[model samples]
Target chain A: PIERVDYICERSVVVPVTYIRSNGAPAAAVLEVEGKMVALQWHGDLKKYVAIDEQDSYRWADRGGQATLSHLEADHTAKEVTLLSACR
Target chain B: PIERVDYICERSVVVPVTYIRSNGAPAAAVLEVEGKMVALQWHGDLKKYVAIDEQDSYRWADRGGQATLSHLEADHTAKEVTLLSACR
Candidate 1:
């Protein structure tokens, strides 16, 4: 499903997005923030979110452009993305 | 901003949700699933998501109603919710 959610933030904001499995068990997700992207997975043992790529930290300059964020998961596939903060 | 996202699922699905700090550093979030709720926070040390209430598991019968889900956070306040499942 292509869902778009917007939020106001300063230079940096850690946006929490959720993914639900539709066809199978818990799987991984590819999240794209601004232009950078990362992979995340659900850890059943810890019952938390973990990076599939093992690289979670992301930074986008405060430029006067739409700071888009989007994700693609095993169950939930490609959707929409948009940014609200000014990234330099 | 009030954002709406929909998903399809079976009887049980472990959903992985992400919460980013918009106003300040990472904090806690109250997530309501189909009426059942739980608190979640980001663990910097572990770099993973953890349940604040410690009750991470949730179950909602496949009642065929819109399994509404929403959340509230220290940085991002109350937002919209909806479901796409047959919860009994």
Candidate 2:
């Protein structure tokens, strides 16, 4: 249900997708966020932004498997996450 | 800096982007979310999911023109939205 932070970018950031949810939010090869060049998605119900799955798809907190970036908690989801790996 | 609610979508919801911000979040034709259909973005600094603009781009509160769905406030951004017009 959790993994690790792997990507953060400046421009032309390729939000890697790695999940399967045909019934969730739409999937994207890239996200169109305003001020951040990242692979985050909007959780309408949670009112918070989250990282996309491996296939560039969004997932809920209750989901079975999730990447660290997709963590629903605010400490990880918000406050501009710290890049523990690749922040291109 | 403010507007009216215009979109709350379901599967394959076309998030009608209607603004311009070249240096904000990346632009996408669709979004990837969990359990909801909408065009919101993650404001890294604001810690919330915002709506995308006409071109499927994200915007910030400081930006001059913003859609009603892109508002930065939690009342509209959070609470799963009221769907004044569209909740498909």
Candidate 3:
């Protein structure tokens, strides 16, 4: 028995490029949706501050579905992430 | 300039191939992993019953992560879908 097949939009709602914190180990964010943001604690370079919007984060949540809302608000407590600002 | 860098697993915990029903339109199932299963009403060919396990369904859930369980059980009642049996 098979289930439902969802579709991915041709154009991503993701921002261009951004940084994100990783869980367990030190990691950088990759892809992200627009308006969504992530903050990270500088793991390698202490003097460097990192902030990212949309483009790249983690593929943990849906960009345009029900999980979008939770993924949006979860930024504050995610691993060591924060929402510094919004994307342009 | 950046935060942490994340890594994708060298190996994917996905099944080989399976068919899955489309959400709104009638689509043939394509790609699936193992163990995971899906059932659907014959939309295109009435005599053709669609059943699939793991190989391919939809990319809606993680094959090895948290959402895997939910995706397994949600096979029924999904946009004109059904659960005929399990995957072998």
TM-score of each: 0.23, 0.18, 0.21
Model 1 RMSD to the real structure? Answer: 14.6
lDDT of 3 by residue, B1-88 (tens): 1112111321222333333345654344333322223343333544343434332232322222322212232345544322122221
User: Candidate 2's residue-wise lDDT over B27-78, tens digit each?
Assistant: 2222333322234444566644455433333332322232223322334344
- Chain B TM-score for the candidates in order: 0.33, 0.22, 0.20
Instruction: Write model 1 residue lDDT over A25-63, tens digit each, in one string.
Output: 443323444433333454567443345432232222212
10 residues in a row with least lDDT, candidate 3 chain A: A3-12
lDDT of each: 0.36, 0.33, 0.30
DockQ of 1: 0.03
lDDT of 1 by residue, B1-88 (tens): 1111223456564332333342354433234344333334545674433444332322222123334332233344433223334332
Instruction: State the weakest 10-residue window (summed lDDT) of model 3 chain B.
Output: B1-10
> What lDDT score goes with residue B44 in model 3?
52
Q: Judged by DockQ cut-offs, is candidate 1 incorrect, acceptable, medium or high?
A: incorrect
Candidate 1 regions with alpha-carbon error over 4 angstroms: A1-20, A23-26, A55-88, B1-88
Which CAPRI category fits model 2?
Answer: incorrect
